[PDB]
Ligand binder design. Structure first.
Ligand SMILES: *[C@@H]1O[C@H](CO)[C@@H](O[C@@H]2O[C@H](CO)[C@@H](O)[C@H](O)[C@H]2NC(C)=O)[C@H](O)[C@H]1NC(C)=O
Ligand SMILES: N[C@@H](CCC(=O)N[C@@H](CS)C(=O)NCC(=O)O)C(=O)O
Ligand SMILES: N[C@@H](CCC(=O)N[C@@H](CS)C(=O)NCC(=O)O)C(=O)O
Ligand SMILES: *[C@@H]1O[C@H](CO)[C@@H](O)[C@H](O)[C@H]1NC(C)=O
Ligand SMILES: *[C@H]1O[C@H](CO)[C@@H](O)[C@H](O)[C@H]1NC(C)=O
Ligand SMILES: *[C@H]1O[C@H](CO)[C@@H](O)[C@H](O)[C@H]1NC(C)=O
Lengths: 440, 152
């Protein structure tokens, strides 16, 4: 018996660069699944929203209010510290937790069986940097990361993938998540006086751009300082409606990465649909995953109701009166076997719960235009062609295949600057001079 | 002393500690599972109730992002030096870690990844069992760890 309406969850912080694009995109796909009668099936899929102020407390307390409400799924957290704890209350209520902005390389494991990840695993950027570094041959990197659950799990991977190529991370500098403009200066001064100039930065996007506004005004970004940035930096730009060309002057040589997505007419009509909406045009490509995840619910919601006649619940100071979701691991099992093609190309999940084709569009920032100096893929790694071409090929592992365009490093140089710089710390260079008696 | 427990799963402990916070308290003798101790140190940070652990030993808890988590046991950061002093005392220099995949395992060994770099050693292969460990997952692991490059 197909009911009147089904309720899914939505945990995403409204007051950030991801959520202000996510909230129309979830509202957009909700309007299309109630317009598409092939997936409607007499059911009005309304989506209960539940914001959070990016804190671990009221994220869970809002989601416990979602679990007191009846749900069948929950469009997951993107904060990735909420996504640990909610994937303990979704590991005991058997509710599938489909994240769109997780990017945490420990959530795809067997201790979290109900945490499916629609975005690409952050485990692959730390390969794509560890393919980018041994491409240029720098081999000694000093990392900078916010000390959240996303940093300490992220740069622990890059410590390990660089160990296979005999590279290493020298000094895991770590900003505190509540950071003013003083704790950034106390740290970025203390890493100028060290042995490397290849900075990986992996910071949350809202306070992420305030790292470079300290690095410019400290004299760091100059000749001989390679800045590599992960996905937050294009999300810090593309969430702004137009690049204001002062922040672009801060970013002169920083080799950022970005989630590559193959184009189609479905994504093309969505971009014109996005121009029809205008939430100040903060199109930052996480809304492209947030528009995907509602379809990935709804198409899996469609297939599950051709088998099951009806969803089923139960009943279990403030007591534990939360309604558990009976018969959920069957509904979780059909979502892993999905072969849907959303707006971001094909969707498939292998045994490691990753999405099947991770591809990163490298980009350089040298002028006022971000030009894409290559494409990283899981398949080949560092092409210059669009990485959908090589997917039918055999995996070609050649040194002539790992190839990139002209890269402009900071200081307006274009030869790859040497990483090592001798430190100015309390140790002096102990030159050992012999004490000659003959032939002085 | 109001006694509440978890059953070593993180779900009912945070519900049960929220019952302690639904109750009025002036302190809280902290958890020791340290998957609990991350979440309860986000409910202590919004209720200003001091959380004092005795069995935390998770070397990412002693940070200023958690202003209300004082640790009365020895910080596990000071144990991973003692292995990294014992290894360079024997001169073994290459070590295959085995850790449960809790927060005491990843943050525990990522410290040993860091401290062995300062003495120019390294960890070969961070093998990682799941939290609910069968006696078949350990055989599936430790067969594939005999076939590697280190014995320490
Ligand atoms: C990313 O690429 C690697 C390399 O091919 C994939 O690893 C392979 O996975 C299949 C089954 O998943 C195994 O049979 C192969 O032996 C693996 N190859 C290697 C070299 O390990 C990996 O699965 C890819 N990721 C995704 C999400 O598809
Ligand atoms: N928590 C963020 C909002 C959401 C967010 O961006 N979370 C991080 C945690 S991992 C993220 O998704 N980062 C993507 C990345 O840098 O790879 C904030 O401080 O506003
Ligand atoms: N969580 C444990 C019981 C409590 C416990 O022992 N927690 C661990 C994880 S922090 C601990 O105290 N470890 C101390 C140590 O290994 O140094 C269990 O499996 O039931
Ligand atoms: C998914 O679909 C593609 C073509 O649409 C097919 O080649 C592939 O085998 C399918 N995978 C499945 C059914 O697991
Ligand atoms: C967090 O930010 C929100 C939105 O700006 C605002 O309500 C307030 O400053 C904070 N909320 C609380 C009380 O945590
Ligand atoms: C402990 O008992 C609980 C009931 O509170 C039940 O989940 C199980 O038998 C035990 N749980 C664990 C994981 O120890």
């Amino acid at each position: 018996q197909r009911p009147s309406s089904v309720n899914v969850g939505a945990l995403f912080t409204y007051d950030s660069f991801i959520g202000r694009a996510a909230k129309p995109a979830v509202k957009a796909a909700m309007d299309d699944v109630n317009a598409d009668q092939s997936v409607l099936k007499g059911i009005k899929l309304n989506i209960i929203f539940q914001d959070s102020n990016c804190s671990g407390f009221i994220g869970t307390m809002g989601a416990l209010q979602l679990m007191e409400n009846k749900v069948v799924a929950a469009i997951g957290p993107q904060s990735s510290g909420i996504a640990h704890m909610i994937s303990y209350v979704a590991n005991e209520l058997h509710v599938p937790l489909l994240s769109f902005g997780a990017t945490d390389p420990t959530l795809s494991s067997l201790q979290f069986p109900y945490f499916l990840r629609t975005t690409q695993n952050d485990y692959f950027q730390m390969h794509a940097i560890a393919d980018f570094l041994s491409y240029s041959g720098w081999r000694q990197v000093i990392a900078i990361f916010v000390d959240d659950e996303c940093g300490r799990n992220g740069i622990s991977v890059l410590g390990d993938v660089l160990a296979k190529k005999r590279s290493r991370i020298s000094y895991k500098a770590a900003i505190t998540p509540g950071a003013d403009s003083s704790s950034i200066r106390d740290l970025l001064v203390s890493v100028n006086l060290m042995e490397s100039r290849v900075f990986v930065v992996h910071v949350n996007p809202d306070s992420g751009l305030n790292v470079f506004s300290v690095a410019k005004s400290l004299g760091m970004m100059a000749s001989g300082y390679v800045w590599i940035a992960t996905d937050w930096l294009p999300t810090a730009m593309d969430s702004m409606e137009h690049v204001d060309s002062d922040t672009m002057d801060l970013l002169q040589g920083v080799v950022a990465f970005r989630h590559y997505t193959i184009e189609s007419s479905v994504k093309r009509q969505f971009m014109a649909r996005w121009k029809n909406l205008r939430p100040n045009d903060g199109f930052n490509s996480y809304a492209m995953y947030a528009y995907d995840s509602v379809w990935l619910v709804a198409r899996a919601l469609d297939v599950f109701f051709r088998e099951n006649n009806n969803i089923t619940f139960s009943n279990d100071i403030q007591l534990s009166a939360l309604s558990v979701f009976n018969e959920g691991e069957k509904f979780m099992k059909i979502i892993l076997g999905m072969n849907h093609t959303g707006v971001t190309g094909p969707i498939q999940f292998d045994s490691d719960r990753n999405r099947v084709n991770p591809a990163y569009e490298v980009l350089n920032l040298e002028g006022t235009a971000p030009r894409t100096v290559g494409y990283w893929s899981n398949h080949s790694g560092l092409s210059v062609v669009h990485p959908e071409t090589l997917y039918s090929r055999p995996p070609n592992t050649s040194t002539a295949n790992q190839r990139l365009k002209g890269i402009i490093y900071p200081g307006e140089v274009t030869k790859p600057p040497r990483g090592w710089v001798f430190p100015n710390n309390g140790k002096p260079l102990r030159i050992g001079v012999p004490n000659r008696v003959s032939y002085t």
